Amino acid sequence: EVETFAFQAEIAQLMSLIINTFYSNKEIFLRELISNSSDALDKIRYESLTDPSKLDSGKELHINLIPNKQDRTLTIVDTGIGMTKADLINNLGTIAKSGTKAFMEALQAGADISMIGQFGVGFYSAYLVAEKVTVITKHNDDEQYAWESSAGGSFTVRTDTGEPMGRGTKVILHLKEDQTEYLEERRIKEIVKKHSQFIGYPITLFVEK
């Protein structure tokens, strides 16, 4: 049922540096995840321009942000193109080996962690705030899969048994104990307004009981 994989050495090194480096401006993780949702939304939009049946798995193109203080999770849902199993295994659709190398060289030429998305590896900034990340994804070709990792060098992939998602990607951030500010409505609103004001899909921040 569950397959466990080793990250490539460079990606393990990227994740160790994100986890261990002192860096206070952690809120940029949300901009990076919302940007990857926007890129995935743009891909299904573009494919649907020539094949409208690609939206038979959901016509609405949007992003939901769902805090849960009881579970200590922040979930980012989109209805973008989704990832195949192969793309999930292959670093969640990114060019992460080469992007890591360039990001390292840049951190040497003075860059800072907030520039991670210039290297094609912004997903991994989730580990600024999450002890465990779970990525549930469904592409029109393919079945629904769950990826997960608490870092430490490995990740798992399984066929997902949760709720069907139609099409798209859900990123569940299991927050570190000192990072619960990212469940607060005022804090999430301030970060989306500062860094994702011009994203071209609706972003709905859910509220809690």
Ligand X SMILES: CCOc1ccc(-c2snnc2-c2cc(Cl)c(O)cc2O)cc1
Asked if 11 and 91 count as a contact pair (C-beta separation under 8 A), the reply is yes
Of 3, 9, 21, 46, which lies in the binding site for its own copies, with binding defined by CB under 8 A?
46
What residues numbered 63-102 form the site for its own copies, per CB under 8 A?
86, 90, 93-95, 98-99, 102
Residue 36 among known ligand-binding residues: yes
Of residues 89-128, which lie at the interface with ligand X (CB under 6 A)?
A: 92-94, 120, 123
Least distance from ligand X to the Cβ atom of residue 96, Å: 10
What does the alpha-carbon distance between residue 44 and residue 193 come to, in Å, rounded to a whole number? 25
Q: How far is the CB of 150 from ligand X (least distance, A)?
A: 16
**From CA 68, how far away is CA 209, in angstroms rounded?**
9
Rounded to a whole number of angstroms, the minimum distance from the CB of residue 71 to ligand X is 19
Q: Which does 198 bind (CB under 5 to 8 A by kind): its own copies, ligand X, none?
A: its own copies
Identity of the residue, 9 or 95, whose beta carbon is nearer to its own copies in the bound complex: 95
The answer to whether 138 is annotated as binding is: no
Closest CA to 59 of 199, 169, 202, 167: 167
- Show contacts with ligand X in window 164-203 (CB under 6 A): 169, 171
Q: How far apart are CA 61 and CA 38, in angstroms?
A: 9
Whole-angstrom Cα distance, residue 35 to residue 32?
A: 5
Q: Residues 119, 94: contact at Cβ < 8 Å?
A: no
**Residues within window 132-161 making contact with ligand X, judged by CB under 6 A:** 137
Place of tokens 């500010």: 181
Binding of its own copies at residue 200 (CB under 8 A)?
yes
- Edge-to-edge strand ranges of the sheet holding 168-175: 3-6, 154-159, 144-149, 130-138, 168-175, 73-78, 63-68, 203-205
Kindly state whether residue 161 participates in binding its own copies, applying the rule CB under 8 A.
no
91 is in an annotated binding site: no
User: Measured between alpha carbons, how far is 146 from 88 in angstroms, rounded to an integer?
Assistant: 9
- Hey, what amino acid is at 181? E
Which spans of this chain sit near its own copies (rule: CB under 8 A)? Answer: 42, 45-46, 49-50, 86, 90, 93-95, 98-99, 102, 106, 111, 115, 118-120, 198, 200
Binding site for ligand X (CB under 6 A): 33, 36-37, 39-40, 78, 80-83, 92-94, 120, 123, 137, 169, 171
Binding residues for ATP, as ranges, are 36, 78, 97, 123
